[PDB]
Amino acid sequence: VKTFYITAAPVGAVPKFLDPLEPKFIPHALLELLPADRREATIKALEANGWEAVPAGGIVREYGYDAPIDLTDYASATVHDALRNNGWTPSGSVWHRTQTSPSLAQPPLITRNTLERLSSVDLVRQIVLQLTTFGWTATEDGSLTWAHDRIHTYLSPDFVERMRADNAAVLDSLFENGWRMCGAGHWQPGKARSPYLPITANGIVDASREALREGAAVVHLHTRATDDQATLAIPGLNTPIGIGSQRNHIVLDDYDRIMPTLLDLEPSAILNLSTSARGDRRASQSPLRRAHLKRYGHAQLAPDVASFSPGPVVFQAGGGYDNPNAFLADQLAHFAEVGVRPEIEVFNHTIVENSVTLYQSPLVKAGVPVLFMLVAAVDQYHRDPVSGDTSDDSLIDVPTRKAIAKLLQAGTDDAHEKAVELAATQLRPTVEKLRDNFPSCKISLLLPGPFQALLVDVAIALDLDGIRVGLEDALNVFDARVPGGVRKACGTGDQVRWLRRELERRGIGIVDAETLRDELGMSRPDVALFRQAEAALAHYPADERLVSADTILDALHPIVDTYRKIEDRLAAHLASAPADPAALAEHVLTAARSFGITIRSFVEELDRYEDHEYLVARYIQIPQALNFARELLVPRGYSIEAYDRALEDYSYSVRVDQFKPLPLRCLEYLVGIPCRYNSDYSNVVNLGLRQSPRYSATMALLYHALRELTLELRDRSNASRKACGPLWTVLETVRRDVAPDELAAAIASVDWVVLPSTPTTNYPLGIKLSNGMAQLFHGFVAQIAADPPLRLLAITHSGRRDDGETVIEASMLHNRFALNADPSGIYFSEESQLIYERLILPRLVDKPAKLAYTERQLRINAEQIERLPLLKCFAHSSGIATAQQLDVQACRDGERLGLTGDELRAFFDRALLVSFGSAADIHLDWLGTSVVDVTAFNDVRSLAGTTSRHYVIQPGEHADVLQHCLVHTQPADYRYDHATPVWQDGRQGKIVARLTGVFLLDDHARLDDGHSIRRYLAASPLWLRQWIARFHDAPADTGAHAILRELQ
Ligand SMILES: [Mg+2]
């Protein structure tokens, strides 16, 4: 019931990146070896970058960082002895290290048992924090280890003493494992630094992606300047020291890279850009503070949120920036023209007071709900303009912060509650003040460093809307597996994961980006466009008998115009001269995807091709994109001379009068908005649209118009004429196939019936596909036969209807969605009837009946109802829809023939269904066949055709497996064993086995091509095959009995 939305802040202004592969200690001798001038410059540069001079007594673990020292490039008795004592031997002017430490053949490991030997828990933490700052990692065991082929880890004398004092053992093991004593020199403690802080564009993109997949809905961004970036060369070290301010600064070139990438890879992610001038107060009124707030990418989208502080920001720790009123007014004016909603960064009480009075009206006008960010536990100053005196303006007063910090150190549960109460009591007046002056507002909380232990409890107490985490606020993360309980955070995603699991523990859920965009009124344009169509068709029934395509097209007129403008922009971009080989397709497809237009691979796309009979179709993707480009440029008058390079391929050119008209292209676009892929097939977006009340009806109507327009285009082509009525084919043991015409004996002789999918209609290509699917299913079950005379029956749909209308893909898709929108089991197609009456109807009669020339038709025996043989059916794609339409017709005849409701249940218990990639909803509360349902998350076509939430993967266990398999090589080995069956019982006894967490890898270990029946069967787990094995090798038995046994 209670939910938070998580903001991730991966960069920030203050913390700095520290390279794990840089030396962390410089002996005195190495510096003293320099000339006085260069030595002074080097040392002061080091000390400005965190390096601290340190006496002898520290220990080091180094390997691989030596370099020869030629004194000609720059001895002394004080130097010469130090070098020799530190293991250097001279050879004229050249020094080199002959002393060498143990290699890293076997990773350095400080065991959990070794650390736990130490008495002081505070000492353990500082050790764990120091090593993890240096790039050491924590094992699952709870130990510390080093993975790289070089190492240079140092600990100060202070560490060594306390280690020796606490336990003069523990220090033992380091010495026994290659660590050794050092002299005086300089040391990099890495204070306010981390090896995981992203300061480059690519690093920031990656950190954002990690945060989002862990559950973050909003990403707070900063960028860092590199104008003062330099490297120090140290004598005797083969790796230079990186120096620079890494100053908080708005870098336009970085955002020019970051934003389009995120828009492509993370389309729904709410992007929040910092306008902060922290680190450069003299630029407080600079237009640079809004220069990054513009439209990015081909989609021309702006950031959704930008930082806004109605008052001065003055940190007690130093730094800060001013926010003059005219400047802020220019900001708000600019935000409005670009579509940016401000987020009020509430640093101090003056901000609050300015917000609820003078800025109250301008902020409401800036868009509702008003967004607030509570920067709590960060010491702030107010400065008197007259005297210059400072006072505490912090949300939590400094005495209270210092108090709270002490209770956190106590570590006891009682000190925690007192800490929470202190924090909440101080923040409550501010929270209440904001709610009282802003009827529509969202308030989030952030806490710096140690106080993050209060983050969840305080946020709950104040009933806040959002919680923020990230490296910007804290560099550590709590981990109970680690001695001390705390370690360096391996990124913001690490902390988001911690926060998410913490909320899960308390039964508190989180809000994803898509849902939040609705709550804040920030829905994406394509989502808005689809809902605009949903609204325009809201009063039309999903029944094809009650509405015409012309009427549907007429209602979508303003939306077609909206799409036309998008297509114009894609056309212009394509007409901007490129490439010569068949890589034009790669160019076109990338351009199309970026503009939101998804070029789909239709099986029946060859219907538009003149010379289809002489086409190979294995290279049918390349000309799809080519003709698509031609299809867009020709009507507008653009040259297609670059294209028609399909001549250099093996016509594939599509005739001009086979070009799709504008409204048809619009319809194709609209039905492609739900369940989109991101740019590189890493994820599925726009999953929310499925949950709309009018979703299925809208899709049914869209495909209705799409069917009409496509058929008209097919009637003017030399596409293969289709045949009336279904085909029946038996496969026994490569399988041999026969073609029954009027035999009920085939049904009795066969183990498995294979229902038709969408493309398997009665015509040359359709039969070929129908055969291939049948062969795949028979090779699948036959393989199961040889593990711990196989006969199959395959059904092909009718290619023509009663009125002579051709059956195409859109016809089946409409039927699919129309079935979804049917509340009572009353809807069924003509194609379903032909299959039903010849396959299912005889199971309800007493004897052979009369069948017409169209193969359509013209009692009970309750004792023999249990005697009916178990009908085992395979289903794929739209197969589950066709199946449920058979159940509907059975009820219609069964009720007409007369049977108890329980009798019909017994009738349906004599049948079984296994569906791979269910592209239609399973009506759980209907009378019908029990189903085992296996549908993949990346099966976008099945997803778009369904409304069940079980198919959607959210951050968790299944999401973990998915991301592991995204980086894993050898995709052919992949099986979805991790899949979890969910079990449901309907009102009328229908049983559904829903597998969750299922997904299918492609050849590039991505998520494309997730509808192939091959991958569904290929990646099938061993435990699943056992179920089918039990199904196959079963006596005269019931479904409910057989399936219920599988629940143990
Ligand atoms: Mg910030």
Side-chain angles (χ1 to χ4, degrees), residues 1-36 38-39 41-75 77 80-139 141-175 177-256 258-281 283-336 338-417 419-420 422-575 577-579 581-585 587-599 601-602 604-612 617-618 623-640 642-644 646 651-654 656-720 722-731 733 739-740 744-767 769-782 784-786 788-789 792-801 803-829 831-837 839-844 848-849 852 860 862 865 868-891 893-894 898 901 904-967 971-1013 1015-1029 1031-1037 1039-1040 1042-1043 1047:
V1 42
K2 174 58 180 174
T3 64
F4 288 109
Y5 67 87
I6 298 178
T7 300
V11 187
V14 176
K16 304 185 184 180
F17 167 69
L18 180 60
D19 202 331
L21 303 184
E22 281 187 6
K24 295 294 143 51
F25 177 76
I26 301 176
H28 202 264
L30 298 187
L31 292 179
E32 206 170 7
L33 178 144
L34 283 174
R38 292 175 56 176
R39 173 166 60 255
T42 293
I43 290 184
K44 76 167 301 181
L46 285 171
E47 297 194 307
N49 288 264
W51 290 79
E52 297 178 356
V54 68
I59 62 181
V60 75
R61 178 72 176 101
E62 60 169 335
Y63 183 82
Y65 282 95
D66 295 317
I69 307 177
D70 199 342
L71 290 184
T72 311
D73 292 343
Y74 319 101
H80 173 279
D81 284 291
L83 278 83
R84 225 142 182 161
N85 206 328
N86 279 337
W88 296 75
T89 59
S91 178
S93 54
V94 177
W95 289 78
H96 60 96
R97 256 206 182 179
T98 49
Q99 161 220 16
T100 303
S101 302
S103 77
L104 301 177
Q106 230 36 181
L109 176 73
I110 301 180
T111 55
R112 168 147 173 76
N113 283 321
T114 299
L115 291 171
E116 270 178 327
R117 280 193 167 193
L118 292 169
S119 309
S120 176
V121 68
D122 182 66
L123 176 68
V124 178
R125 295 196 176 108
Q126 300 176 24
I127 291 177
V128 172
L129 285 186
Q130 261 294 346
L131 295 193
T132 53
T133 300
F134 284 169
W136 291 63
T137 57
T139 69
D141 172 272
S143 305
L144 300 172
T145 180
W146 179 267
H148 310 97
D149 52 10
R150 293 175 176 225
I151 195 169
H152 206 282
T153 291
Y154 171 88
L155 290 177
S156 64
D158 205 88
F159 271 103
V160 184
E161 301 162 7
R162 295 165 58 195
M163 255 183 295
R164 200 194 309 273
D166 189 289
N167 202 325
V170 176
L171 183 59
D172 63 348
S173 179
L174 305 177
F175 289 143
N177 274 7
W179 297 64
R180 70 200 333 167
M181 302 291 299
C182 322
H186 272 84
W187 167 43
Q188 171 59 272
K191 285 168 180 169
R193 293 163 182 261
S194 172
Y196 305 107
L197 190 74
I199 61 183
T200 65
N202 289 338
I204 291 162
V205 164
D206 287 338
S208 299
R209 301 250 281 143
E210 298 167 7
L212 288 159
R213 68 176 183 244
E214 289 290 355
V218 186
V219 185
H220 203 319
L221 295 179
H222 291 241
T223 50
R224 306 294 189 89
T226 59
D227 47 18
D228 66 326
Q229 207 176 50
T231 51
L232 289 179
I234 310 295
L237 292 175
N238 60 26
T239 300
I241 310 294
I243 61 176
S245 309
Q246 289 177 43
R247 198 186 73 259
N248 180 69
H249 188 76
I250 302 180
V251 185
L252 301 183
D253 289 337
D254 281 346
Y255 279 121
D256 284 343
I258 293 173
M259 295 296 293
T261 298
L262 283 180
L263 290 173
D264 270 330
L265 294 174
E266 307 284 344
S268 297
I270 295 172
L271 305 178
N272 180 359
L273 307 194
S274 187
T275 63
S276 171
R278 185 180 190 174
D280 189 19
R281 58 178 172 91
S284 290
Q285 302 187 27
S286 172
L288 175 59
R289 296 186 65 181
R290 58 175 177 269
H292 57 322
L293 306 175
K294 58 175 185 176
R295 293 168 170 85
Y296 292 93
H298 295 298
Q300 286 289 91
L301 299 180
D304 307 277
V305 177
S307 289
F308 189 84
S309 294
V313 185
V314 186
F315 301 93
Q316 294 201 18
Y321 49 99
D322 189 38
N323 302 279
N325 294 320
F327 163 73
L328 291 177
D330 288 334
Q331 295 289 89
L332 288 186
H334 180 78
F335 287 19
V338 182
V340 181
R341 179 100 50 94
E343 187 192 38
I344 321 300
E345 309 222 279
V346 183
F347 284 99
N348 47 66
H349 285 290
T350 307
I351 295 291
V352 181
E353 147 173 297
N354 288 340
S355 293
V356 304
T357 59
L358 208 49
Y359 279 94
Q360 200 280 336
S361 170
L363 285 179
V364 165
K365 184 190 175 185
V368 294
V370 182
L371 311 175
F372 288 98
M373 206 52 234
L374 295 187
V375 194
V378 172
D379 293 349
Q380 284 281 317
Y381 274 147
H382 169 269
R383 170 156 288 156
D384 176 89
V386 192
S387 65
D389 289 3
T390 60
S391 49
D392 188 21
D393 206 28
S394 311
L395 296 181
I396 303 183
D397 64 77
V398 175
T400 304
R401 179 196 51 76
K402 286 175 178 175
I404 290 177
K406 266 204 36 159
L407 293 117
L408 293 179
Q409 268 158 354
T412 178
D413 279 10
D414 280 77
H416 189 73
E417 271 169 64
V420 173
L422 282 181
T425 301
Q426 286 267 317
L427 288 173
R428 175 127 44 215
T430 292
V431 175
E432 290 179 342
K433 194 179 219 189
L434 290 173
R435 311 264 205 199
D436 290 352
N437 290 267
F438 293 100
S440 184
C441 75
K442 300 291 181 177
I443 302 173
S444 298
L445 173 69
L446 76 87
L447 289 174
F451 302 89
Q452 279 196 348
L454 309 177
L455 209 36
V456 173
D457 287 325
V458 167
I460 297 171
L462 299 175
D463 195 39
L464 301 185
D465 309 282
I467 302 178
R468 174 174 132 170
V469 292
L471 297 191
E472 170 165 0
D473 303 335
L475 298 184
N476 305 330
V477 62
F478 293 110
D479 195 337
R481 303 167 302 180
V482 171
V486 68
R487 58 171 176 84
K488 217 69 173 182
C490 298
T492 291
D494 201 354
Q495 290 162 335
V496 175
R497 181 181 185 87
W498 165 85
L499 178 56
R500 172 172 54 84
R501 298 185 97 247
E502 187 65 35
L503 294 174
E504 290 175 1
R505 248 194 57 232
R506 308 159 182 263
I508 304 175
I510 63 179
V511 182
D512 61 309
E514 262 174 47
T515 304
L516 189 53
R517 298 189 85 103
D518 291 348
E519 280 185 38
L520 305 181
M522 298 175 175
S523 60
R524 284 304 194 194
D526 63 330
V527 163
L529 187 60
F530 186 84
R531 285 168 174 167
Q532 190 182 329
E534 186 170 308
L537 306 175
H539 292 134
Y540 296 110
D543 202 327
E544 47 185 333
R545 286 172 268 106
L546 302 188
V547 67
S548 71
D550 284 340
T551 303
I552 300 176
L553 286 175
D554 189 71
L556 297 176
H557 196 76
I559 290 181
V560 175
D561 194 78
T562 297
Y563 168 75
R564 181 194 55 82
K565 285 152 168 176
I566 300 178
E567 202 176 70
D568 281 324
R569 286 178 39 82
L570 177 56
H573 178 247
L574 293 180
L584 264 305
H587 181 62
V588 167
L589 282 156
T590 41
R593 266 190 292 263
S594 61
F595 277 85
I597 297 182
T598 301
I599 309 175
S601 55
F602 305 87
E604 303 173 346
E605 183 66 14
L606 285 173
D607 293 14
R608 293 171 58 223
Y609 290 76
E610 185 94 286
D611 306 336
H612 53 97
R618 63 179 295 274
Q624 265 186 18
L626 293 188
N627 291 283
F628 177 84
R630 304 176 58 243
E631 200 173 30
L632 259 56
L633 300 191
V634 165
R636 319 195 186 281
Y638 290 121
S639 167
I640 62 171
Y643 309 101
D644 290 320
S651 173
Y652 276 21
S653 151
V654 170
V656 177
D657 86 311
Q658 275 297 299
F659 282 171
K660 300 169 180 176
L662 176 61
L664 175 50
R665 302 199 299 271
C666 177
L667 291 170
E668 287 189 346
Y669 168 71
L670 285 175
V671 295
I673 296 175
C675 304
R676 258 180 47 228
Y677 283 114
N678 59 345
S679 54
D680 71 338
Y681 303 91
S682 305
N683 200 26
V684 187
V685 311
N686 296 338
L687 298 175
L689 298 178
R690 314 190 313 134
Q691 303 309 312
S692 167
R694 283 287 297 181
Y695 176 75
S696 292
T698 309
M699 294 290 279
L701 289 172
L702 289 177
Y703 273 116
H704 186 291
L706 208 157
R707 176 206 46 76
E708 169 96 349
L709 291 178
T710 300
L711 283 172
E712 145 179 35
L713 216 58
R714 195 186 193 279
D715 295 8
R716 307 196 322 261
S717 68
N718 55 336
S720 313
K722 308 201 173 164
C724 315
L727 291 182
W728 309 82
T729 297
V730 188
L731 281 75
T733 313
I747 296 178
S749 65
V750 160
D751 309 271
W752 291 84
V753 174
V754 178
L755 296 175
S757 57
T758 302
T760 63
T761 47
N762 199 337
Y763 82 115
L765 180 59
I767 310 175
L769 300 170
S770 184
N771 291 336
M773 236 196 65
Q775 182 180 301
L776 274 166
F777 269 115
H778 165 86
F780 174 71
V781 56
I784 299 183
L792 251 67
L793 176 64
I795 312 178
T796 303
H797 267 307
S798 172
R800 304 274 286 259
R801 283 182 176 177
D803 46 20
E805 192 188 284
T806 305
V807 175
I808 54 178
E809 157 198 85
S811 310
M812 302 285 91
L813 285 170
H814 166 80
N815 178 255
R816 230 177 58 186
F817 285 110
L819 187 62
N820 278 10
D822 194 26
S824 308
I826 68 175
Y827 182 86
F828 65 99
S829 66
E831 294 75 58
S832 301
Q833 193 169 34
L834 297 167
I835 303 181
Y836 160 73
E837 310 207 306
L839 169 64
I840 307 300
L841 178 59
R843 312 175 66 85
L844 292 160
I860 312 181
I865 292 189
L868 296 156
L870 177 70
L871 182 59
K872 296 166 295 184
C873 305
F874 278 135
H876 171 66
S877 185
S878 54
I880 186 56
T882 298
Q884 271 169 135
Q885 283 171 83
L886 304 194
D887 303 2
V888 167
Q889 299 182 69
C891 294
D893 280 346
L904 270 169
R905 297 189 188 192
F907 173 79
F908 283 132
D909 211 337
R910 298 307 305 178
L912 181 85
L913 242 177
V914 179
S915 183
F916 292 93
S918 300
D921 284 337
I922 301 179
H923 306 263
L924 182 52
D925 292 333
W926 285 7
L927 269 173
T929 314
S930 293
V931 193
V932 170
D933 180 26
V934 186
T935 302
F937 168 72
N938 51 321
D939 193 343
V940 296
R941 201 187 178 204
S942 292
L943 259 188
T946 51
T947 61
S948 182
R949 297 183 181 266
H950 290 296
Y951 297 156
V952 179
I953 298 183
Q954 324 234 55
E957 294 180 14
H958 295 159
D960 287 331
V961 183
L962 183 142
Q963 245 288 335
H964 270 150
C965 295
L966 282 183
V967 305
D973 298 326
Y974 167 75
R975 293 180 178 84
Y976 48 97
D977 324 312
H978 59 276
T980 308
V982 181
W983 297 88
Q984 324 191 225
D985 299 86
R987 292 261 285 260
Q988 317 249 1
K990 178 180 268 188
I991 304 179
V992 176
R994 197 98 60 177
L995 301 206
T996 63
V998 181
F999 65 93
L1000 308 179
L1001 290 185
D1002 75 337
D1003 298 342
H1004 309 277
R1006 288 300 181 231
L1007 296 178
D1008 196 353
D1009 193 73
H1011 194 55
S1012 88
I1013 185 56
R1015 294 188 205 276
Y1016 262 108
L1017 297 176
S1020 180
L1022 194 149
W1023 59 271
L1024 177 56
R1025 313 192 184 194
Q1026 167 139 324
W1027 297 17
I1028 295 179
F1031 283 152
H1032 190 199
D1033 299 21
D1037 215 322
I1043 317 178
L1047 277 69

